[PDB]
Design a protein around this nucleic acid. Sequence first.
DNA 1: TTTT
Length: 89
Amino acid sequence: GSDPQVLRGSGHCKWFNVRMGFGFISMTSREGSPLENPVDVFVHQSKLYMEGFRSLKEGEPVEFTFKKSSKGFESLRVTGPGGNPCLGN
DNA sequence: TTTT
């Protein structure tokens, strides 16, 4: 019934490195409110909603769930706008 | 699997 640290956010891919299997999202809104200061959120390839090889393209818009982690923040599931598949490279 |  509860998972209180899990929040919803939106933004765009800051960078993504397919050799390393991760990148960052620049989060520009959370919990339905735009942010005065964008926040980087780590994104691992395993979290990307899409078929085939998983990546994010620099600048593509994303919606996601995330949670604070030991090293920063962590994306938990990442989609395009409206829950459609991410585009990637 | 935490910086670009």
